[PDB]
Amino acid sequence: MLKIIIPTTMLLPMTWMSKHNMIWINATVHSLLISLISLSLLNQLGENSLNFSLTFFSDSLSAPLLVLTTWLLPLMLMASQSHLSKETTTRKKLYITMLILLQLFLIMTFTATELILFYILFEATLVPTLIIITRWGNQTERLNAGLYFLFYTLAGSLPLLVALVYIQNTTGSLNFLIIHYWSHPLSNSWSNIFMWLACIMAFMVKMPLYGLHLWLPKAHVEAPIAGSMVLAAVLLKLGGYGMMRITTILNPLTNYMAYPFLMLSMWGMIMTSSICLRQTDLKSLIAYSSVSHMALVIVAIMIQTPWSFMGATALMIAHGLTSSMLFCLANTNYERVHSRTMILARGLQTLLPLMATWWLVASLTNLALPPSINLIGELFIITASFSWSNITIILMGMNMMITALYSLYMLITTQRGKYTHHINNIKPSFTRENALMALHILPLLLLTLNPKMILGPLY
Amino acid sequence: LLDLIWLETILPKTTSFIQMKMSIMVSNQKGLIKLYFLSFLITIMISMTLFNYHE
Amino acid sequence: NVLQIVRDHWVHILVPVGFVFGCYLDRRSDEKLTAFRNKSLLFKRELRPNEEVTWK
Amino acid sequence: PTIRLQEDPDPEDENLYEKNPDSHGYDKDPIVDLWNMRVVFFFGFSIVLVLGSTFVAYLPDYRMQEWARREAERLVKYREANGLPLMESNCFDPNKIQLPEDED
Amino acid sequence: PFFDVQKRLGLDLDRWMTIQSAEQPHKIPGRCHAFEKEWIECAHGIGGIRAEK
Amino acid sequence: MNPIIYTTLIMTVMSGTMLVMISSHWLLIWIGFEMNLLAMIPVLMKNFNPRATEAATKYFLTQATASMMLMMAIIINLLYSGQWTITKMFNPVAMTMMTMALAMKLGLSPFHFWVPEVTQGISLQAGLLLLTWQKLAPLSVLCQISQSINPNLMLTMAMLSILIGGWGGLNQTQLRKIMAYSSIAHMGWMTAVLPYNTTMTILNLLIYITMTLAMFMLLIHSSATTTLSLSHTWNKMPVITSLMMVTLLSMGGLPPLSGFMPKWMIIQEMTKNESIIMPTLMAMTALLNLYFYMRLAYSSSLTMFPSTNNMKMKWQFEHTKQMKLLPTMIVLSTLVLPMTPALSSLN
Amino acid sequence: MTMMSGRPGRVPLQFLPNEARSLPPPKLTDPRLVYMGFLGYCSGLIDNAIRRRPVVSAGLHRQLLYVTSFVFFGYYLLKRQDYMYALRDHDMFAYVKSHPEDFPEKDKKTYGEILEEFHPVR
Amino acid sequence: IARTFYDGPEKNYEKTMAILQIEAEKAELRLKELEVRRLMRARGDGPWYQYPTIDKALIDHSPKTTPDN
Amino acid sequence: AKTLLHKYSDIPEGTECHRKAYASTSIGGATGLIVSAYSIALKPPASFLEGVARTGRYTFTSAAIGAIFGLTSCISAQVREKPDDPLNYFIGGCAGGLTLGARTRSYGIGAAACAYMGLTAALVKMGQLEGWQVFAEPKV
């Protein structure tokens, strides 16, 4: 699949050789073309995966993720060029270089045929994200946010490296196809229990699992808008992808090692949804929303059924799109009033009607209105959990009610009421912002029209 | 109670506190060769008996 | 006059050229994995009177 | 000086609508901004969205759904006529399986 | 680590003084010449691990 | 000091190291160590001041003690087997004393106190020499006797070195002391894999030397010895601060940078034995070195610190002396991971 | 532990034994050589940037020398690496052939005779 | 679309076959190399792990001024 | 030395709790003596009697921790009739940690020490059961 990798590596010198006033145009056009090219990966088979070479392969689980990455790059470019207008040309090119490198690492991560190469790329994604957050953030908390983002990740990921090299010394290969075909059960011993934990905790902290998520509100609030977009839409899904890949060698030990993570996921889902009800910062609310949805995804991956895997794939794609749209919507108001407090600017539907429509659609997809793919994933996961145990419906049921409550709370607080009297600098919505919202939302409904493209390999 | 205090208290704040305390313990030496040459003597004697006596 | 136009918009061929180069390299990579061409129990086939290989 | 440092004052934010009442919010230069709008719209809505959706809609059936349906129709027809059971509990012929000799 | 410059150039910078059975002046023998000679001959070319046993 | 005398002293240092590396006789190895120390002492005092004199005195005392123990271990080995050849070291007490003497020469923990002090007391060129060239001879000797080495003592000292390097580096604002603690931790990593595979020791040594050379040359280019003086470099040469930031990231061990390769290969080699717990602790501890590298990157490259008025005069002038090998050192420090299988040529 | 330090017939400082001439040399379009040339080009660019010269256009002779030197060293580096791996495989196969008792080829069993426990997922 | 952008299933099928063969052989070779390294380091009778011993050519075989050496 | 380690480890788990407690006390006392030696060398106590007091304090703390750990670990093992179970070592480690907390008069130190020593002792028991090696001998 070098027909996708090489054009991004060419995006790099194209950006560094462009005129000072055409960098955004060139980057956007060629990013969109690369996304169109990557659209060809959706032609998947029913039995095995597309095995391009010894190094790269495409499954029905990673193709929508690659398409989402390549589609997210141009949106980040449009979202970034507003607040980077006063920046020098060299620093703007460096920002675009960081974004391009992040896309390249993400594209290679989702198609690596070996687990060590996957590890190296999934860990290389850290440097551009950390640089973006700590260099182009606005407030002084960005440094602490970068430290939290780095060390939470590495403390989980290093035992994974040890476990991976141990597994390769034991079985002779880390190639995923060989690993799948030559799978052997895991006994019940302390060594196997700790091997399970080493293979699972890095992906758990990436989701992130409740109690291990404290880095996420910091990193997602302190980052610039493109950083938040790529952190919520793609980088959280690395944990889910890696967990569905790695669980192939963990049976039958998972049958009982999943209990603490399942309880944490369900209860912390309830807790993070409740936290969303009393939040003064508009971005932290969206971050905690992400935590709740990812807790659902964790449950689906842990119970290990075809329906749960289908629901996990659909939910990951839907959440990426929805959360990126919500972050952009909040950033528009932040750029207008230079504050993140939710109750500062109110009654915005009176001043900005079309942006209010975009807010309504985004918050409707957040609460999983049917027949959106958000609800398809959520309902598949709920059915799988009900088959796992009939008592999960209570916890799942509570979550649905709470999610609707806080979504509409956000909508009513920001759009309805009366406009604050002292704020008189609320200019009309630019064409760029409306195009950004439309390019977020239209693919969601288009995917609803044909949902088998995001349902994973278990379809 | 949970997100802002105890979840913070157990994993990251404890790690930071412990690392800072051990950094203070390790790095704060007066730079007098007498003290750490005495340390060298202790290390040498322990080494012969602890790891050298058992071959 | 095309000198200035070319020197201002020559950065627009890098990405299509990278795309065609990636296609070529993918074909070259496929060229090295033909050890089982027309040899699987499911797709083994007698050759046509004219064709040389079943796939490229 | 009762100060701590020499610093520029924090400047007021620029309104792109002041110098360009139809500004599109892409750039301060009207021509570059207009062409940025045009390329974004053309390559996002006209090219990727509509054409990509058509391409995805008309993708060939490599998932073998219709092939499987036709194969199942053939199998059901054959098994119904012969009086054979529609489906078998064992998917592997027991003649090719060798159970362990002793169960005691 | 060890660059065998002596072996490569055939110089003998210090090998003359490594063992007691190697060409003493006036052919004066070491007290344990025969024992060292036999131990060296027995262990020559088989490697360190094999020799120790 | 005369340039001719300086060049003669540098060649004598290197001659002592090469004599250590090419000798087959224990006496010649000890002589190489003596010659190296004798020539190294004046190089530390090239810029004469009380701090340089104190650093030279401490270095001399530590290394003279180490060489005395080295000679005693050689003599005990000779007593129990009339052998002068550098080999499996037929006596265990002599081997223990030899290991302790070489650890003292390298600065492995518990005997690690001298390194931060000598590094802070000398100039950046002397520190470059001390932390790069002076590791070769003891490591070569350790490689040649790796079979007879006792794993329990060497691994204890290696883990202590990693822990103490991280903890000590956490507390420093002086750049030379940060470099010294980083050196201690990397020495620990080097000696942890020595009983299992000396090729990994050599690979780690080479990569560490490259990164250290790049860091010291960047520090000499922008004449900064404190954190606050390095915080001004962005307003004079931003490219230097960016390259330093990337090199600091590489030193931390983050993939896809070249720094990650030695740790990766050492972990793999240790898991090829049983040895599971030790690499896990070593990686968790190297996270501390990553922390203070990241703090330095925050202070010098990712944020802009306030400057002074007189920097405007410095803006008008260029750097006269130019280091010809700095670009190659930076590239080798950063972008070398894809060439990892080339380590086979090291054995 | 040194695996290849003392292998019989090894010449101390050769870097390329005559036996290595029996192996196919790396192609001049080897992607590893291209990556070495990329490293040399990066070194040239960094050299331009550090000296406050126009990064892409300043010295073409210097950049050419950088790329050429990196490629030249990389060619011999790759030759030596391939020779070492060929030596390792040769020794492995010879040892397996000369110690048949330690490497037995036991009877093959089909999956229809191997009893594997089934763990339901429910 | 199929004629213009994609190949038949047999190409992917047999490419997968080749890839699987290569990866399985590499895994077997890795396990065999680990076992061979273990045996060679344990016994010391292989080309690998050879440690230097004193050269026998250093011995002087001359009359030593005393008949009994 | 390893003589004390062998003296402790030779006795079976849930048998002869007094001897096991004695061996644990000896191990703790040796550790405390080494700690006090290093502390006196690097931090001189300005008086001989003060150095004796510091040595006694550290040594008694370590010996008490070891005695409590061994006593409660063996008692739990023999009461539950479940040797080779890491929970006995976890209980012993938490008891030693609470002993340390009482010895320093600090609740937070006591709780942290209970948790960490219990976890570490349980890990050591798991390593004894499964054969985990802290310092693996070279094999390849």
Ligand SMILES: CCCCCCCCCCCCCCCCCC(=O)OC[C@H](COP(=O)([O-])OCC(O)COP(=O)([O-])OC[C@@H](COC(=O)CCCCCCCCCCCCCCCCC)OC(=O)CCCCCCCCCCCCCCCCC)OC(=O)CCCCCCCCCCCCCCCCC
């Ligand atoms: C993985 C896949 C492959 C990727 C490979 C790895 C990545 C790429 C290679 C890396 C090394 C290459 C470049 C090295 C030299 C760069 C140094 C530099 O300063 O550049 C400035 C220089 C601009 O200077 P100028 O033009 O002379 O005038 C402007 C002034 O100098 C104005 O300059 P100034 O000094 O006044 O401005 C100050 C500025 C100056 O500071 C900088 O410029 C920072 C540059 C540091 C270099 C990177 C360090 C060493 C490399 C390690 C990279 C690690 C990558 C792995 C992932 C980790 C991410 C770090 O400092 C700041 O503003 C502080 C901002 C703080 C941000 C901190 C982030 C820095 C690290 C980011 C590194 C990312 C990779 C390289 C990014 C691209 C850099 C150009 O950039 C360039 O113009 C050259 C870049 C383009 C050259 C390649 C083009 C090839 C020819 C085109 C045709 C293509 C052929 C295709 C074939 C097919 C036929 C068609």
Ligand SMILES: CCCCCCCCCCCCCCCCCC(=O)OC[C@H](COP(=O)([O-])OCC(O)COP(=O)([O-])OC[C@@H](COC(=O)CCCCCCCCCCCCCCCCC)OC(=O)CCCCCCCCCCCCCCCCC)OC(=O)CCCCCCCCCCCCCCCCC
């Ligand atoms: C992912 C989701 C979320 C997860 C993460 C978030 C949740 C977990 C983390 C958050 C909670 C963990 C914190 C643990 C305690 C922290 C202590 C502390 O911070 O010290 C610094 C802090 C600083 O103090 P300081 O500077 O040293 O001196 C000033 C003092 O404040 C001045 O002190 P004072 O004069 O005011 O009086 C202090 C005195 C008296 O305190 C008072 O004045 C008021 C009375 C309060 C004492 C409570 C005991 C009686 C009530 C218990 C009833 C049953 C328990 C519930 C279970 C029901 C089962 C159906 O307390 C004592 O003497 C302690 C003696 C021991 C009795 C209490 C310990 C009982 C152990 C629990 C057994 C559980 C086993 C499992 C059961 C399984 C079935 C569910 O210490 C305190 O001030 C707190 C003192 C009380 C601490 C003990 C309370 C225990 C709480 C439950 C622990 C369970 C969690 C850990 C389990 C894992 C361990 C293996």
Ligand SMILES: CCCCCCCCCCCCCCCCC[C@@H](O)O[C@H](CO[C@H](O)CCCCCCCCCCCCCCC)COP(=O)(O)OCC[N+](C)(C)C
């Ligand atoms: C804040 C969020 C962090 C993330 C959450 C991570 C979740 C980690 C939890 C690990 C899940 C299970 C781990 C081990 C599996 C069983 C646990 C054990 O309690 O079960 C019994 C174990 O019995 C006893 O409990 C022994 C263990 C007692 C010591 C463990 C210490 C637990 C104390 C709590 C410390 C907190 C840990 C997390 C730190 C943050 C089963 O009996 P047994 O059949 O014999 O053991 C089975 C293994 N066999 C078959 C080889 C024998």
Ligand SMILES: CCCCCCCCCCCCCCCCC[C@@H](O)O[C@H](CO[C@H](O)CCCCCCCCCCCCCCC)COP(=O)(O)OCC[N+](C)(C)C
């Ligand atoms: C502003 C004013 C708005 C209101 C006015 C609008 C006026 C009416 C227009 C609205 C249209 C109504 C929709 C009704 C559905 C009709 C279309 C439907 O029939 O087509 C579907 C086809 O839809 C497409 O398959 C789905 C589109 C694919 C979506 C991919 C998005 C493109 C990529 C963009 C970036 C990706 C980001 C997300 C990463 C994963 C049928 O699927 P299928 O059953 O098969 O067809 C059977 C026959 N075939 C197979 C021969 C073709």
Ligand SMILES: CCCCCCCC/C=C\CCCCCCCC(=O)O[C@H](COC(=O)CCCCCCC/C=C/CCCCCCCC)COP(=O)(O)OCCN
């Ligand atoms: C910021 C939060 C992130 C925290 C994540 C940290 C938790 C990671 C989980 C533990 C990682 C260590 C596991 C080691 C890698 C496994 C490889 C393996 O299989 O080794 C086993 C051995 O297993 C071990 O040795 C593991 C022992 C543990 C040593 C280090 C302890 C680390 C801390 C333990 C408790 C914390 C783990 C759970 C934390 C949950 C998250 C907070 C097999 O070895 P053999 O000897 O060959 O087996 C048969 C021959 N005897």
